[PDB]
Amino acid sequence: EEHVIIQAEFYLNPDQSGEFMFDFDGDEIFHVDMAKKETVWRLEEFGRFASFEAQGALANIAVDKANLEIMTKRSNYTPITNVPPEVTVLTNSPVELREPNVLICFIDKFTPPVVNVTWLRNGKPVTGVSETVFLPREDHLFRKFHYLPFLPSTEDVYDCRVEHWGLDEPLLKHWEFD
C-alpha cells in the first residue's frame, strides 16, 4: 500500500458538532469549518494548488447527524464507551536556548473526539492558539496535535493540561530544558 487518502467525517451528540476532513498518508490535507463554512488547509500553500466547495461537506454533515439519530435508536440507546487519551510531549526541534522552537502535545488513542487542552509556563496558563482537528486512527479512535511556540530557557517548566471525559482527573505533562 503506497498511499491512502481518507475522507473522514463524524457527528456527535449531544454536542451537535461535526467535522469533515481528508487524511493523506497520515496528515490532514484539509478540513471544513462548520462554524465559518470555509475549507481550511493544513498547509496554507495547498489552496494555491487546489480548491474544494466548502458547502459540500456541510451537506454530508447534515446527513451524518441524521444517521446518528437513526442509529442511536436502532442501537437501543447505547452511548460511546469513553476511551482515555494517551498524552505525550515531544519537541519540534532539538531545544537550544533562546532559539525559537515549538512544543508539541500529541494526544492519541482517545475516542470521544471532545477534548480540552491548556498550556502552562511556570504554572499560570498561557494562550495564541494552534491545534489540529481530530485525525482518525485505523481503529476508529482519534489523535490530535496541539502546539505551543516557546523560547527555550532552563528556568521555565512547561505544561500540557489535557481534559477528557476519560480521566477522572485532568492529565498533566511536564517539560523543560534538560
Partner: protein, 205 residues
C-alpha cells in the same frame, strides 16, 4: 474577445452533425492530408479529406482501413468532404464504453454524469470525445446559449495513470469560425480506452 462572442461562436460552430463513416479505405496519403474513400456511405466517387499534422499524417498509409469521425469546416464542395483529424484504426469487434464523469460547477453542488455518454471504439480521438461531451453539455446545460450564465469552464480527460488533459470549453480563436475552432484537431490526438479513467467538467458562474 468578450466571452459574449466566444460563446455564440461555439454554439454556432458546434451545432453540427459530425461526419461518422465506419471502416473505409485510405486512397492515398500525404502530409497535410489523408484521402479516405467514403464510397459505401455517401455516393459514387465521393470521399473525405482529413487535414492533419505531419506526425499524425504519417502513421496511416494507402489501402489502410480506418474509422472517420470529424466535424466539418466547409460544405457543398462537390464530391469532397473536409475535416481535421477524426481518423483512428478501424474498429472490428463491437464494443461499448460507458464513460464516467464528475460535473463541478463553480457555485453549485458536485454532480456526476456517469454512464450518460457511450463510446463505441477502443481507440478514440479527443475530437470524438470532446464533441459528444460538448453536445451533451449543450443539450442539457445550454452552456453556449446567449442566456447561459457560465463565463468559462473546461473538460479534463482523466487517465488511469492519474493525469488530466484540459480542453477549454469557451475558446474562440481568430474570426471564430468552424475552421478556426476545429483546426486544433489537426494533431489527430487519440486515446486508448484501456487508459481512460474518467472525465471532469468545470463550469464557472
Amino acid at each position: 474577445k468578450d466571452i459574449s462572442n466566444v460563446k455564440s461562436d461555439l454554439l454556432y460552430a458546434y451545432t453540427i452533425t459530425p461526419y461518422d463513416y465506419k471502416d473505409c479505405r485510405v486512397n492515398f496519403s500525404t502530409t497535410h492530408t489523408l484521402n479516405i474513400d467514403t464510397q459505401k456511405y455517401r455516393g459514387k466517387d465521393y470521399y473525405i479529406s482529413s487535414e492533419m499534422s505531419y506526425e499524425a499524417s504519417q502513421k496511416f498509409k494507402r489501402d489502410d482501413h480506418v474509422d472517420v469521425f470529424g466535424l466539418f469546416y466547409i460544405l457543398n464542395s462537390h464530391t469532397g468532404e473536409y475535416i481535421y483529424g477524426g481518423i483512428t484504426p478501424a474498429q472490428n469487434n463491437k464494443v461499448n464504453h460507458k464513460l464516467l464523469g464528475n460535473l463541478f460547477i463553480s457555485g453549485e453542488s458536485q454532480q456526476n454524469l456517469n454512464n450518460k455518454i457511450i463510446l463505441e471504439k477502443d481507440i478514440v480521438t479527443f475530437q470524438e470525445i470532446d464533441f459528444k461531451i460538448r453536445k451533451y453539455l449543450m443539450d442539457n446545460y445550454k452552456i453556449y446559449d446567449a442566456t447561459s450564465p457560465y463565463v468559462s469552464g473546461r473538460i479534463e480527460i482523466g487517465t488511469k495513470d492519474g493525469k488530466h488533459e484540459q480542453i477549454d470549453l469557451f475558446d474562440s480563436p481568430n474570426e471564430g469560425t468552424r475552421s478556426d475552432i476545429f483546426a486544433k484537431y489537426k494533431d489527430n490526438r487519440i486515446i486508448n480506452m484501456k487508459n481512460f479513467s474518467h472525465f471532469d467538467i468545470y463550469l464557472e458562474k
